[PDB]
Write an enzyme that holds these catalytic residues in place. Structure first.
Site, PDB file in Angstrom:
ATOM      1  N   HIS A 171       8.586 -45.927   3.044  1.00 48.80           N
ATOM      2  CA  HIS A 171       9.241 -44.649   2.693  1.00 48.80           C
ATOM      3  C   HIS A 171      10.556 -44.866   1.935  1.00 48.80           C
ATOM      4  O   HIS A 171      11.653 -44.544   2.399  1.00 48.80           O
ATOM      5  CB  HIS A 171       9.442 -43.811   3.947  1.00 48.80           C
ATOM      6  N   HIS A 231       8.097 -44.950  -3.285  1.00 49.38           N
ATOM      7  CA  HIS A 231       7.157 -43.948  -2.784  1.00 49.38           C
ATOM      8  C   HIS A 231       7.425 -42.582  -3.416  1.00 49.38           C
ATOM      9  O   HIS A 231       6.504 -41.950  -3.945  1.00 49.38           O
ATOM     10  CB  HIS A 231       7.211 -43.849  -1.262  1.00 49.38           C
ATOM     11  N   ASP A 248      11.150 -37.302   0.874  1.00 44.93           N
ATOM     12  CA  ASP A 248      11.388 -38.264   1.957  1.00 44.93           C
ATOM     13  C   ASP A 248      12.836 -38.756   1.996  1.00 44.93           C
ATOM     14  O   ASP A 248      13.104 -39.824   2.565  1.00 44.93           O
ATOM     15  CB  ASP A 248      10.418 -39.456   1.890  1.00 44.93           C
ATOM     16  N   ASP A 258       1.480 -36.779  -1.917  1.00 44.96           N
ATOM     17  CA  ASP A 258       2.023 -37.660  -0.885  1.00 44.96           C
ATOM     18  C   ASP A 258       1.050 -38.778  -0.535  1.00 44.96           C
ATOM     19  O   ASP A 258       1.479 -39.896  -0.216  1.00 44.96           O
ATOM     20  CB  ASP A 258       2.379 -36.831   0.352  1.00 44.96           C
TER      21      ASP A 258
END
Ligand SMILES: Cc1cc([C@@H]2CN(C(=O)c3ccc(F)c(I)c3)CC(F)(F)C2)n2ncnc2n1
Ligand SMILES: [Mg+2]
Ligand SMILES: [Zn+2]
Length: 341
Positions: A81, A85, A122, A233
């Site tokens: 994360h 990403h 995120d 995602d």
């Protein structure tokens, strides 16, 4: 001083054409993790330009350059994360725009909000899930546990804190109604990244697909934005096998680190986070079959041009069965030793 120099070039050098990033940059076959991290902020600008969001919303270039660098700086470096990403998630949003004709389904401001949410979704992730926040009595759980989606509420709050930083509000010339609309969309879209939310709305997504998308139905717009966000995602799984193998490695590294922290707290981790119990092939097949495959099947049901995405996910799922046998130790270990017993 580093960001200042990066800022100066990003603002004064010009926005590179998207085709100069890579020849297949707008293809579902392109793997955005192949781009060096030092090139990703310029790539963000190039995609925003190519989608005509800079012109259409009259985004101030100094503000946008600062915003993009601030978002990048707002990610930490856990195995999965991290900023790469968020960048790859944003890239997939761009691919949906280039390949799927989203303007026939969604308002311009909704497509723009989806892209910006992808960049931010995120922010400040610590490599632990929502359950860990509550179990560890973290500050984030203190703020948000009564509402749920602890991490996702934090990601949204971090996105707002970036906008509220002087020089970084890319939306500050919007009308009051348009500004309110943008931040409300960002709230809904970022909160949609909680897989528990996806699982709760899944039957409503199925019903929308069955009856047919209604562009005059406000709930259909909301549901579609949730499905698109989730599709971005999880989009690593729509790439080739080598991408998904590496992403599995990064996921389990992050998960197993969380499980190590839980055991040190006296708590039994989830099986998928316990390096002594997790059996990776079985877990990936369960994730592919029960979560990832149904998402891309819904997307194919709504956009026939998304068929290749579903076929790739299904192919990757079948690859996991083909390699499962390799997790059994045949013969002796490569060192010829049984010491590990
Ligand atoms: C692109 C991608 C993203 C993720 C995870 C999925 N997530 C889960 O909670 C989860 C739920 C059920 C499972 F069976 C497993 I395994 C993990 C949330 C997240 F960790 F944030 C990212 N995985 N996980 C495995 N392959 C992935 N590929
Ligand atoms: Mg997330
Ligand atoms: Zn994410």
């Amino acid at each position: 001083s580093a960001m200042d120099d990066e800022y100066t070039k990003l603002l004064h050098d010009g926005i590179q054409p998207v085709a100069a990033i890579d020849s297949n940059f707008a293809s579902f076959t392109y793997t955005p993790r192949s781009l060096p991290e030092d090139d990703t902020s310029m790539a963000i600008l190039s995609m925003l330009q190519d989608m005509n969001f800079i012109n259409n919303y009259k985004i101030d270039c100094p503000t946008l350059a600062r915003f993009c660098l601030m978002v990048k700086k707002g990610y930490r470096d856990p195995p999965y994360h991290n900023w790469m990403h968020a960048f790859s998630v944003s890239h997939f949003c761009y691919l949906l725009y280039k390949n799927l004709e989203l303007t026939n389904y969604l308002e311009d401001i909704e497509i723009f909000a989806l892209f910006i949410s992808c960049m931010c979704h995120d922010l400040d992730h610590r490599g632990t899930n929502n359950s860990f926040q509550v179990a560890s009595k973290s500050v984030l759980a203190a703020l948000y546990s009564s509402e749920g989606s602890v991490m996702e509420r934090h990601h949204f709050a971090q996105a707002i804190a970036i906008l509220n930083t002087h020089g970084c509000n890319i939306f500050d010339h919007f009308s009051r109604k348009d500004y309110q609309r943008m931040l409300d969309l960002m709230r809904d879209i970022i909160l949609a990244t909680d897989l528990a939310h996806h699982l709760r709305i899944f039957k409503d997504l199925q019903k929308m697909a069955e009856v047919g998308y209604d562009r005059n139905n406000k709930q259909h717009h909301r549901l579609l934005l949730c499905l698109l966000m989730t599709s971005c995602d999880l989009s690593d799984q729509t790439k080739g096998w080598k991408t998904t193998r590496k992403i599995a490695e990064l996921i389990y590294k992050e998960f197993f680190s969380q499980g190590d922290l839980e055991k040190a707290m006296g708590n039994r981790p989830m099986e998928m986070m316990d390096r002594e119990k997790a059996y990776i092939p079985e877990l990936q097949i369960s994730f592919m079959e029960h979560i990832a495959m149904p998402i891309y099947k819904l997307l194919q049901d709504l956009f026939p041009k998304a068929a290749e995405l579903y076929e790739r996910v299904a192919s990757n799922r079948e690859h996991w069965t083909k390699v499962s046998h390799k997790f059994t130790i045949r013969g002796l270990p490569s060192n010829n030793s049984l010491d590990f017993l």
